[PDB]
Structures are given as C-alpha cells and as structure tokens.
Ligand binder design. Structure first.
Ligand SMILES: Nc1ncnc2c1ncn2[C@@H]1O[C@H](COP(=O)(O)O)[C@@H](O)[C@H]1O
Ligand SMILES: Nc1ncnc2c1ncn2[C@@H]1O[C@H](COP(=O)(O)O)[C@@H](O)[C@H]1O
Ligand SMILES: [Mg+2]
Ligand SMILES: [Mg+2]
Ligand SMILES: [Mg+2]
Ligand SMILES: [Mg+2]
Ligand SMILES: [Mg+2]
Ligand SMILES: [Mg+2]
Lengths: 195, 195
C-alpha cells in the first residue's frame, strides 16, 4: 500500500548517481527520500555477487576464504567476501566462480544460489546474489592458488576457521584498525549462535 | 600502503552526500573512486545499530524478530533486522534496546556487541554495530509488545523460527514480492552452514 511516485535526479557520475525519491505513505501523505543508485546494473536481478567460499580439506575443519582490500569510501581496509559485478548475460553463479578465481585463485563448485538481497535498503537499490561455493583444498589445482586481479585491484587473501570465524574476525579489526563487512559479520555471528 | 588523498564534494542533501575520492594504491599511483556519505555524521562509534532479536519462550523454538518496511531506495518492501541511527550521547547497547522497543515493542537484554562494521564498503562509509539482544518472551512486558513508531515510520513485525529461518524467508519471498536484507540472509545461511 505504499508506492513510488517519481524519481527526480540530483547528480551523476562514472559509477554512482544520486536522486530524490517521492512516494506515498500508507495514509496517503506524500513523502521524500534521498536515494543512491549505481550506473552499472542493467537487466540483472542484482548488481553483483558475493561468494561464501568454503575451503574443504580432509585433515581440517572448513575455512571461510575472505579478502582484505582498501576501500576508498571507508578510507581504509575492509575484510569482505570475494565479490564482483555480473556482466550482461552472465549468470550469478558464473560470475561468482569467475570473481572467486580472480580474487583468490581458487576454483570452486556451486553449493547454492540465493535471491537478490539488498545491501543497504534505507539508502540504496543495491542488491546482490550470495552464492555459496565449495573449494577442494586437497585438490592439486588448489595447491598453490595464484590470484589474478583486474585493472588496479589489489587483494590480500585471508582464510579463517569456520569454527572460530567470529573470534578471529574480532582479532583482525583491533590490530590493523581494519573493518569487517556487515554481511561477513552477520554470518560469523550466526555461526557462533548455532555452534 | 594505501590512503586517502582528497575528497571532493559533488552533491549534498539533508541526509545524503555524494563525493569524489582520490587515493593512492600500493605502487604509489593515484586513482579515484565515487563515494556516498551521510551528512548526519558526528563523532560516535558508528552511524547506527542493527539488532538481532532472539525471542525466547520456554519449551518453544527461538524466534528471530525481523521487520518489514517500505524502502524508497528500493521501490518496494524489505525484511530487515530492526535498526536505527545512534542518538547523540548514546551507547550502541542503548540504541539497540531503544530501536527495538520502538520498531517492534519488545524489550530485551543485551547479549553481545560487535565492533562497527561496514554496510557497503565500495560505495559508502556507513557503519553499524550489530547487537544481539535476547527477548524473554515469558515475561509480561513482552506478552503483548507495543510498537511505538516514529513519525512517518511504518513497520510490520515478522517473527520467524530461528531453527528454520532460511527456509521460512524463502517462504515469504515466494508468497509475494519481497527483498530480504543481505545481513539477514547471511545470518540465515550460516545457521544452516554451522552443521
Ligand atoms: N565507485 C567506484 N569508483 C571507482 N571504481 C569502481 C567503483 N565501483 C567499482 N569500481 C571498479 O570495479 C571493480 C570491481 O571489483 P570487484 O567487484 O571486487 O570484482 C573495482 O575494483 C573498481 O576498479
Ligand atoms: N536517506 C534518507 N532520505 C529521507 N529520510 C531519511 C533518510 N535516511 C534516514 N531518514 C530518516 O531517518 C529515519 C531513521 O530511522 P531509523 O533507521 O529507525 O533510525 C527514517 O525513518 C527517515 O525518516
Ligand atoms: Mg572484492
Ligand atoms: Mg567485477
Ligand atoms: Mg574482481
Ligand atoms: Mg529503522
Ligand atoms: Mg530512530
Ligand atoms: Mg525506528
């Protein structure tokens, strides 16, 4: 019972744009909101993907493979799930595997896909697909993983124990003034709650 | 090795601010990046809080209390963890318990706190504290919780079994068009991954 009335643009850019959104609340009163939008998504259900890489070895408990990388908007380094954009025509699952191999060097298999989930609904229309992927650490191809980053992408890879992911994440945030992604943290919190 | 060199304003607004950021990579080369910021930024620990509300009643499965709200930036409705901005001169924990009682009516006890985590690193600088709050559902004050929403806020409370969260979420996405918050989904995926 709430609908968007109009979207009056405010600014533009090479990657991001900002607009004013007019909408109707339940009662009928018109209200406004400042909405952020990207300029890269086209027909895809989500801007990009986020991979939950589960490293599996026969003599070890599963590791969650993450990536450390300086993020300009934060003016610092963030520990996130491998992530990327979905090219036109590319399936979320494909993009997830491609981006994982690019940012970590690991070839993996799909475990599951998810619906389009929002990154910050109270601010942007940004949605992504969280793809759970498995990686065989015992395989000879994953022996010495050589990352293959794109133009100007500099990524460090950090594998953390699924069993102790939350504690290990708290450790890295204090010593390097680092920042963990909210999704990575919510995932580690559930792992604690369940275990 | 990488740091901010300059942040050029591009646009402003009562709540949102667009910006162009110029920084240096590891090789000593300069690059840019478009970013977003909340003009309502002071000097606290984080922009706001996200509350993971676990409703606990004896002999019952635990329920994860979520909220459904129309989100202008999304042009539709989203299922999210109760959340709100921290007030000036307020602790995360206090913000968490307040924002919970205002958006769902429930009154709980702090379980654990998280360090500020980034909402969307490659687009914004917004951080939140994810606070796990337990709600004793066998107490009178939580028998019939009274939600006190702020002006123009329209929240619908939705409680789902923690033990079946991921599937009960999909049951809603299938029932009607809805977008689940990425943090909520990440959490739900891990509850299943832990075993
Ligand atoms: N807001 C932005 N400003 C400058 N470059 C961007 C922006 N958003 C995405 N990119 C580029 O897109 C790449 C995406 O990498 P990834 O999503 O981790 O596969 C980044 O490494 C940048 O080179
Ligand atoms: N980007 C925005 N555009 C218009 N109003 C906003 C925006 N961000 C926050 N607000 C206002 O701030 C309130 C914050 O609620 P909460 O997240 O519960 O603290 C919203 O209900 C809006 O009334
Ligand atoms: Mg990435
Ligand atoms: Mg990409
Ligand atoms: Mg990449
Ligand atoms: Mg809210
Ligand atoms: Mg509030
Ligand atoms: Mg509120």
């Amino acid at each position: 019972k709430q609908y968007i009335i109009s979207e009056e643009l405010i600014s533009e850019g090479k990657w991001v744009k900002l607009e004013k959104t007019t909408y109707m609340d339940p009662t009928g009163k018109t209200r406004t909101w400042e909405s952020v939008k990207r300029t890269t998504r086209k027909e895809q259900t989500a801007d990009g993907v986020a991979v939950i890489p589960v490293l599996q070895r026969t003599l070890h408990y599963e590791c969650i493979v993450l990536v450390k990388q300086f993020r300009p908007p934060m003016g610092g380094y963030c520990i996130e799930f491998p992530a990327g954009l979905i090219d036109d025509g590319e399936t979320p699952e494909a993009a997830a595997l491609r981006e994982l191999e690019e940012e970590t060097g690991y070839k993996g298999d799909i475990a599951e896909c998810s619906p389009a989930v929002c990154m910050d609904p109270g601010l942007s229309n940004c949605t992504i697909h969280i793809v759970t992927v498995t990686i065989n650490g015992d395989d000879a191809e994953n022996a010495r993983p050589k990352p293959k980053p794109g133009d100007g992408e500099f990524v460090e890879v950090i594998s953390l124990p699924k069993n102790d992911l939350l504690q290990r994440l708290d450790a890295l945030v204090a010593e390097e003034h680092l920042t963990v992604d909210a999704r990575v943290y919510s995932y580690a919190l559930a792992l604690k709650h369940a275990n």
